[PDB]
C-alpha cells in the first residue's frame, strides 16, 4: 500500500520537475524567452518547449 502512494507521488514530482528542462531552448521560462526575442524566432524557441 505504501508503494502505490510513493509511485504516484514520484510520478507527479517527475512531471512537475520536467518544467525545468530547456529541451534546447535558450531558456526554460516562456516569459523570459518571449520578453527578449522577436516573434518569428520566439515561435521556434517556444515550439521545442
Amino acid at each position: 500500500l505504501q508503494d502505490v502512494v510513493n509511485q504516484n507521488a514520484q510520478a507527479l514530482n517527475t512531471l512537475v520537475k520536467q518544467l525545468s528542462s530547456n529541451f534546447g531552448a535558450i531558456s526554460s521560462v516562456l516569459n523570459d524567452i518571449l520578453s527578449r526575442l522577436d516573434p518569428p524566432e520566439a515561435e521556434v524557441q517556444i515550439d521545442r518547449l
Binding site: D38, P39, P40, E41, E43
Partner: protein, 44 residues
C-alpha cells in the same frame, strides 16, 4: 519607391524605420517581392 539602404527590410519579421513606421509585412506572408534600380527615372 524605397532607397537601397534598408531596401531589404521589406520581408517578414524585419525591423527598422520602414518596417516599423511605413510598411509592415505579416509573419505568414505568401507571395513575391520585386525590386529594381530606378536611377534613370527617379534621379526630394
Amino acid at each position: 519607391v524605397i532607397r537601397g539602404d534598408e531596401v531589404r527590410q521589406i520581408a517578414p519579421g524585419q525591423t527598422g524605420k520602414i518596417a516599423d513606421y511605413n510598411y509592415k509585412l505579416p509573419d505568414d506572408f505568401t507571395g513575391c517581392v520585386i525590386a529594381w534600380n530606378s536611377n534613370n527615372l527617379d534621379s526630394y
